[PDB]
Amino acid sequence: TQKVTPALIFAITVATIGSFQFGYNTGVINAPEKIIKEFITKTLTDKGNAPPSEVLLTSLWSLSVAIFSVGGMIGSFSVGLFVNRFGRRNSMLIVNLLAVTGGCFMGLCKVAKSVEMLILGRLVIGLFCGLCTGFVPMYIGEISPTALRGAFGTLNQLGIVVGILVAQIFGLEFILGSEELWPLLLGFTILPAILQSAALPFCPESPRFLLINRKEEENAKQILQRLWGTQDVSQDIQEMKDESARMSQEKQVTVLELFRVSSYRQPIIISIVLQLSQQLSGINAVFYYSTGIFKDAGVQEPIYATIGAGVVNTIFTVVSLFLVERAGRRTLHMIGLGGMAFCSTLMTVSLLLKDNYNGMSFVCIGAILVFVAFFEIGPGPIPWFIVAELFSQGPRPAAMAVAGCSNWTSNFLVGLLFPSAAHYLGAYVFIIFTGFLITFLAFTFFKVPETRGRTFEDITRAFEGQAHG
Ligand SMILES: CCCCCCCC/C=C/CCCCCCCC(=O)OC[C@H](O)CO
Ligand SMILES: CCCCCCCC/C=C/CCCCCCCC(=O)OC[C@H](O)CO
Ligand SMILES: CCCCCCCC/C=C/CCCCCCCC(=O)OC[C@H](O)CO
Ligand SMILES: CCCCCCCC/C=C/CCCCCCCC(=O)OC[C@H](O)CO
Ligand SMILES: CCCCCCCC/C=C/CCCCCCCC(=O)OC[C@H](O)CO
Ligand SMILES: CCCCCCCC/C=C\CCCCCCCC(=O)OC[C@H](O)CO
Ligand SMILES: C=CCCCCCCCCCO[C@@H]1[C@@H](O)[C@@H](O)O[C@H](CO)[C@H]1O
């Protein structure tokens, strides 16, 4: 009875612009490293100072890159401050002031000759993207029909990887990745923010937020009826009234409370672990260093191979989308972790043997592409939307603040620790990721419940049922 209306597509698509922003700002900074380091050097000396040492330049560059994650840690953790006060839709509209501000700091830092503005820009756009990674799956999770909640939740990741791909393409030297236009490469982030801000007033508020948080049952029902193209929404409305009664009977949920309450501990531990399984897969280490590895394996044009990876990244997100309601979250997440374990292992083996057996070069190239395919089969999309599935209305903002922050914090740690680990371990460094992949494969199989097609009420009651034992 519930259809996919133009209204629903529009509301979800508009939400995923935030996803695009996350992906774009993640990937964009990589291509113009040399150019930006030149800018940093030219700025220091133009201001009278001595030219920076290679160490200082590296430090200032690493800061420009990493400060984005720091902002993301802060932003993701702060989503609880917004979504209950302003609502989900209005939160997304409001924080675009951050996107535009951040983008202007980056777009203007060069002409302003300000390394500080660049760093500040990346911090602010980090804050924005961190809020987005929380806002978007929360919104999509609360407006999607139950039977398509996973598929629609995968559109979040799809926007992210399209963001990354567009970032890679713009980053080409004959596009925006030149010494003249790189401020525009960074400042581009303002355009999606302007577009999304114009469209967001015409998106509905979460009917779940309206009914359960604001006790506006009639408003919620009318929204549902339009969004899903049917007058008959009694099943969903009554589920929401059930959640409303629950929320009124439970204390206001805090972050610390999630680790205290047995009923909350199981899903938050699952939520957190599943974020680590995404980041501690090594996906961002692999993707970033793919260019160097491709080159070392003999790819004559390693940049085009890395764009090829980004294309593979996109194609298999779409595959996940058409498979997550049929196969379920468990199966897809486990296939991806397992397949990535195979490939990261194969990266180590091929890299160890390629100088003695040159055919292993091609295996190394293949292992990277296939790794990326396995990543988007499950561990890419699922952890971003599944946290919204594991909680009822009351705990969900605080949980997604905590989970989201754990996702950002672990990507920070990987960025921070991988180069040192790579230095000492060489090719063996990927066995570290293999270890995490295998550990989380076991965790998933044994500890992660199937959430496909189930109401939040069922899932929550099951967790409570287990907590009663
Ligand atoms: C003179 C030639 C100059 C060329 C300069 C060498 C390029 C540096 C490598 C880019 C990898 C491309 C990957 C970009 C897309 C994926 C981004 C990503 O996932 O990583 C997060 C980010 O890198 C956190 O460090
Ligand atoms: C050569 C290319 C020319 C273009 C250069 C100027 C672009 C102007 C638009 C900027 C807003 C950003 C575009 C909007 C991106 C939306 C992301 C998105 O919707 O992703 C798909 C999602 O998965 C579905 O739900
Ligand atoms: C469940 C998945 C996780 C399980 C993980 C298990 C790891 C599997 C890796 C095997 C690498 C073996 C490859 C060895 C192939 C022989 C290499 C060789 O002899 O190369 C000669 C060739 O002519 C070149 O020039
Ligand atoms: C019902 C569950 C269905 C889930 C769907 C799972 C899809 C996961 C991705 C598989 C990629 C291929 C994996 C098999 C290995 C083939 C490797 C290969 O042929 O790739 C050539 C390589 O690119 C040379 O450069
Ligand atoms: C929950 C557990 C999951 C965790 C994930 C599984 C980790 C397994 C990998 C261990 C790597 C072995 C470490 C070996 C330490 C030797 C390092 C060393 O001494 O390297 C010197 C280098 O050669 C100087 O250039
Ligand atoms: C290179 C080749 C390696 C690629 C393959 C990686 C290895 C692990 C893959 C699949 C195991 C898990 C999927 C099969 C079992 C899933 C069934 C399950 O546990 O889910 C039950 C739940 O009720 C659902 O509805
Ligand atoms: C301290 C230095 C490290 C700084 C890292 C700066 C970028 C951090 C963003 C990590 C996003 O990771 C994405 C992941 O969430 C999933 O959407 O899949 C995507 C791949 O397609 C991943 O890019």
UniProtKB/Swiss-Prot annotation:
Keywords noted in UniProt: Cell membrane, Cell projection, Glycoprotein, Membrane, Phosphoprotein, Sugar transport, Transmembrane, Transmembrane helix, Transport
Specify which residues bind D-glucose according to the UniProt entry for this protein: 157, 278-279, 284, 313, 376, 384
Q: Which InterPro entries match?
A: Glc_transpt_3, GLUT, MFS_dom, MFS_sugar_transport-like, MFS_trans_sf, Sugar/inositol_transpt, Sugar_transporter_CS
Q: Name one GO biological process term.
A: L-ascorbic acid metabolic process
Superkingdom, natural source: Eukaryota
NCBIfam families according to UniProt: SP (TIGR00879)
Q: Which residues lie on this side of the membrane: Cytoplasmic?
A: 1-8, 84-88, 141-151, 203-267, 324-329, 388-397
Per UniProt, activity regulation is:
Deoxyglucose transport is inhibited by D-glucose, D-galactose and maltose. Galactose transport is inhibited by D-glucose and maltose.
- Glycosylation annotated at which residues? 41
| Reaction(s) this enzyme catalyzes, per UniProt | D-glucose(out) = D-glucose(in); D-galactose(in) = D-galactose(out)
> How does the annotation summarize its subunit structure?
Interacts with SMIM43; the interaction may promote SLC2A3-mediated glucose transport to meet the energy needs of mesendoderm differentiation.
- Domain annotation text? Transport is mediated via a series of conformation changes, switching between a conformation where the substrate-binding cavity is accessible from the outside, and a another conformation where it is accessible from the cytoplasm.
Taxonomic lineage is: Eukaryota, Metazoa, Chordata, Craniata, Vertebrata
Tissues showing expression: Highly expressed in brain. Expressed in many tissues.
One Gene Ontology cellular component:
extracellular exosome
Write out the topological domains of type Extracellular. Answer: 31-62, 110-116, 173-181, 289-302, 351-361, 419-427
Role summary: Facilitative glucose transporter. Can also mediate the uptake of various other monosaccharides across the cell membrane. Mediates the uptake of glucose, 2-deoxyglucose, galactose, mannose, xylose and fucose, and probably also dehydroascorbate. Does not mediate fructose transport. Required for mesendoderm differentiation.
Q: Which residues cross the membrane?
A: 9-30, 63-83, 89-109, 117-140, 152-172, 182-202, 268-288, 303-323, 330-350, 362-387, 398-418, 428-448
Q: Which PANTHER family match?
A: SOLUTE CARRIER FAMILY 2 (PTHR23503), SOLUTE CARRIER FAMILY 2, FACILITATED GLUCOSE TRANSPORTER MEMBER 3 (PTHR23503:SF99)
Q: Which Pfam family is one of those matched by this entry? A: Sugar_tr
* Molecular function GO terms recorded: D-glucose binding; D-glucose transmembrane transporter activity; dehydroascorbic acid transmembrane transporter activity; galactose transmembrane transporter activity
Name under which the protein is recorded: Solute carrier family 2, facilitated glucose transporter member 3
Regarding protein family, the annotation reads: Belongs to the major facilitator superfamily. Sugar transporter (TC 2.A.1.1) family. Glucose transporter subfamily.
Annotated membrane topology is: Multi-pass membrane protein
- Region of interest called Important for selectivity against fructose, as start-end residue ranges on this chain: 275-277
Report the subcellular localization.
Cell membrane; Perikaryon; Cell projection
